[PDB]
């Protein structure tokens, strides 16, 4: 009720003046924040990943992130940050192979070893270890498809059906 007013007050100063956050702007922001926190290893956020972050978070489909979109995104990044440092127990600045299941579960996510391995094949570096920008980029789309699924589990059965359209719409986003 209070922190929002003093938060919105400065979402603007970097929203530009089309009031919404661009993929380029979002990049610019993030890379500016990690360099001030050199204790989180990263090769930086590249344009292409900031595009999909904006894609999946953009939801009124104004192609860019307005306030309630930006806020939600940020709030998650901030949750996942603490989760990074916490479950990074060897202080490498990366979430390593064995640290991963710990954190994701902690991020509310519930997977099998099979899924974890492949995540680690697709999002981790050579050794099994996983960057910061990668870990974030990853959780953002887990979080997306998870809400999207939810948004259709009206039957509650943990089982949704979709058609060609819906399938493309919801997945032409990664």
């Amino acid at each position: 009720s209070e922190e929002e007013r003093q938060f919105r007050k400065l979402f603007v100063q970097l929203a530009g003046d089309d009031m919404e956050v661009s993929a380029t702007e979002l990049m610019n922001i993030l890379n500016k924040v990690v360099t001030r926190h050199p204790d989180l290893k990263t090769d930086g956020f590249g344009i292409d990943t900031c595009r999909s972050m904006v894609a999946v978070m953009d939801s009124d489909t104004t192609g860019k992130l307005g306030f309630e979109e930006f806020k939600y995104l940020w709030n998650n990044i901030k949750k996942w940050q603490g989760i990074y440092k916490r479950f990074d127990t060897d202080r490498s600045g990366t979430i390593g192979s064995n640290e991963l299941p710990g954190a994701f579960e902690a991020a509310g996510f519930h997977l099998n070893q099979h899924i974890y391995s492949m995540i680690i094949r697709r999002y981790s570096d050579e050794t099994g270890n996983m960057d910061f920008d990668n870990f974030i980029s990853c959780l953002v789309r887990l979080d997306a498809m998870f809400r999207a699924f939810r948004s259709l589990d009206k039957n509650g059965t943990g089982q949704i059906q979709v058609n060609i359209q819906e399938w493309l719409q919801l997945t032409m986003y990664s």
């Binding site: 344009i47 292409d48 009124d60 697709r122 789309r141 498809m145 060609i164």
Partner: protein
């Protein structure tokens, strides 16, 4: 209907009796920029004293509708949106279409909260828009639009709903009535210069009105100097045609016509008006059923003075049918959007052959059985309607309606057998257009009716001058003979997954595989990346950001059928043939050698690659794989054709016999939608 800005009415109205009180609007601020920018900007003297008061606050009895939602409710406020307002006034003559736009059952007394809704036709879809009940008022009374009795509110909220879709109040400043009409109907706007009537113009008005079409008119303005004409007619000002009647006043049959002035005050003088004993000369029986005697901005006039005094007459019909014709027809609708963008697609019209050929092009199949011999001429009747999207929202920057128009070419009979059918620069230098828009005009939509022999035709939409930026969409209406239709094309792909075994593979590839793989024998993901960069720094064309590792991994985990980490021969041979063709297409489509895919090009590249997508979808691909200048570099291009060649592939096979549908549990839904 599509939900605007993806907000829902019934998920807002629910979320109050659980949340607390009366509802604001994140999507559409009630802050001092939901108003204007310049001429009504945040601090031009004009704007001050202005307050967002709800109906509850300035009115003991806040009603939504009272005494029907009729045309006396709509009365202009301090803004130049007569065009739209006149549109609303003539809307209320049809009850059951007003229905569509206005959900009449809303209240302040039922399960209420402050949110409201309206539906609008928007560039080809129906779109429902939600607003909060707060409105701009100064002193006691209302400022923008207002009712006859001052505690009726519907028409003022509608106005606010139409500003929301347009960014703000000030943006609604001026335009054509047909902009309004169509946004309420999705209808076909026929126009008429009142200098050059067609014969049964008067009988057209009557047909139209009967046919429940929409009607309005206006006297135009010439450079250099004052507004009001001395018969009391407002210059350059939208009026709404409402009544059509011919009745013998003692002596001769009289052509008479009822207009309404959106001010709701100031009716015309000198002739045939309201306080005029020319009404002595008419029979009371149909008279006391048709003429009143009060100032509401509404009046009659001879068709003669109407022809003499009014410049333009716009009409909106709810079908592509013409009113000059007297029988109803069948009609197919084909929709296609596009963009002009300076550098790539903003071409200008044919007056500029150095650029003309870089506008987008559009096929038009006029078909054998749809031929008729009606009206003397033998052909296929059709209608083209080119319309500028969202132009009113770039008014902040200053810009407005471009000057638009189109031309039609006959594709030569030797292209007839082809998909990749694009028309050359030199082609337009050797061939006159076969038909074309009336002119290029700075209207939001330009649409004419045509009749040509059955065949294939290219539609070329454009601005008059090149280098103008802007989005558009096109409605093509075909006349059809009722023995088809209800036929609806759908999202389909087209693999070419062949060439397994050594027989189909080559000894060159066989030998060259051995080279690149090196030690780990299969080609790694990091190995394919080195490869992609090499080609990237070899090929002069083919602009690229660079191929990321996250993408190469994806390429393996695509042709990695056996399962192992990396890519073996057959697995790699397929991968290469695929990159070979993604490249052939990119080349063949890149007709401006930018080394990149613009909007239009993408659409054509996808088609050449076997995909068949609706506009909604092309438009997502673009919005997702494209940079700010709306273009796709080669790497994004592959990433895009890969992802899609997967999504489809994963759909089929999870749905082998074509139940248009598929079903997924949570864990594996994640594992497709996020990986493998």
């Amino acid at each position: 209907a599509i939900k605007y800005l993806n907000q829902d009415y019934e998920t807002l109205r629910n979320e109050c009796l659980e949340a607390g009180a009366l509802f604001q609007d994140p999507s559409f601020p009630a802050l001092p920029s939901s108003l204007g920018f310049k001429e009504l900007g945040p601090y031009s003297s004009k704007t001050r004293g202005i307050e967002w008061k709800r109906p509850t606050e300035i009115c003991a009895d806040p009603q939504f509708i009272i005494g029907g939602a009729t045309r006396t409710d709509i009365c202009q406020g301090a803004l130049g949106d007569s065009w739209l307002l006149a549109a609303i006034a003539s809307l209320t003559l049809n009850e059951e279409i007003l229905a569509r736009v206005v959900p009449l059952d809303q209240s302040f007394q039922e399960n209420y909260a402050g949110i409201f809704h309206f539906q609008f036709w928007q560039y080809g879809e129906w779109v429902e828009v939600v607003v909060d009940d707060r409105l701009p008022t100064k002193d006691g009374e209302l400022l923008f639009v207002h009712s006859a009795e001052g505690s009726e509110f519907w028409s003022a909220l509608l106005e606010k709903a139409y500003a929301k879709i347009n960014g703000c109040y000030e943006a609604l400043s001026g335009g054509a009535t047909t902009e309004g009409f169509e946004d309420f109907t999705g209808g076909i706007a026929e126009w008429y210069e009142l200098r050059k009537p067609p014969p049964n113009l008067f009988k057209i008005i009557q047909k139209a009105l009967e046919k429940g079409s929409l009607l309005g008119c206006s006297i135009d303005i010439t450079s250099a100097s004052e507004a009001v004409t001395y018969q009391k007619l407002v210059k350059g000002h939208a009026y709404s045609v409402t009544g059509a009647e011919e009745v013998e006043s003692s002596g001769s049959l009289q052509k008479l016509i009822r207009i309404r002035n959106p001010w709701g005050q100031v009716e015309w003088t000198g002739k045939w008006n309201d306080n005029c004993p020319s009404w002595n000369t008419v029979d009371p029986e149909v008279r006391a059923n048709l003429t009143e005697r009060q100032e509401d901005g509404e009046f009659w006039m001879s068709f003669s003075d109407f022809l003499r005094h009014y410049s333009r007459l716009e009409i909106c019909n709810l079908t592509p049918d013409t009113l000059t014709c007297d029988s109803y027809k069948k009609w197919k609708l084909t929709k296609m959007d596009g963009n002009w963008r300076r550098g790539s697609t903003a071409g200008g019209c044919r007056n500029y052959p150095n650029t003309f050929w870089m506008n987008p092009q559009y096929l038009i199949k006029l078909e054998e059985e749809d031929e008729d011999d009606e009206d003397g001429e033998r052909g296929c009747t059709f209608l083209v309607g080119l319309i500028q999207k969202h132009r009113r929202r770039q008014r902040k920057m200053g810009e407005d309606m471009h000057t638009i128009g189109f031309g039609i070419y006959e594709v030569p009979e030797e292209l007839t057998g082809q998909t990749n059918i694009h028309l050359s620069k030199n082609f337009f230098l050797t061939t006159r257009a076969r038909e074309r828009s009336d002119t290029f005009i700075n209207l939001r939509e330009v649409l004419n009716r045509f009749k040509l022999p059955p065949g294939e035709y290219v539609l070329v939409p454009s601005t008059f001058e090149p280098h103008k930026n802007g989005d558009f969409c096109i409605r093509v209406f075909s006349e059809k003979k009722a023995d088809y239709q209800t036929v609806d094309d759908e999202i389909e792909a087209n693999i070419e997954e062949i060439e397994a075994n050594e027989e189909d593979i080559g000894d060159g590839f066989r030998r060259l595989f051995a080279q690149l793989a090196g030690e780990d024998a299969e080609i790694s993901a990091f190995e394919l990346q080195t490869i992609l960069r090499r080609v990237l720094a070899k090929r002069e064309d083919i602009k690229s950001d660079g191929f990321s590792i996250e993408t190469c991994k994806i390429m393996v985990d695509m042709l990695d059928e056996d399962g192992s980490g990396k890519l073996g021969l057959k697995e790699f041979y397929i991968l290469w043939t695929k990159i070979q063709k993604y490249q052939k297409i990119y080349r063949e489509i890149d007709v401006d050698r930018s080394g990149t895919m613009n909007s239009y090009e993408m659409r054509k590249a996808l088609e050449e690659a076997g995909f068949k997508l609706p506009c909604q979808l092309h438009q997502v691909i673009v919005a997702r794989f494209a940079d700010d200048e709306l273009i796709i570099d080669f790497d994004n291009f592959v990433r895009c054709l890969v992802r899609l060649e997967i999504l489809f592939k994963i759909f089929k096979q999870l749905d082998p016999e074509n139940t248009g549908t598929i079903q997924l549990d949570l864990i594996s839904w994640l594992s497709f939608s996020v990986l493998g």
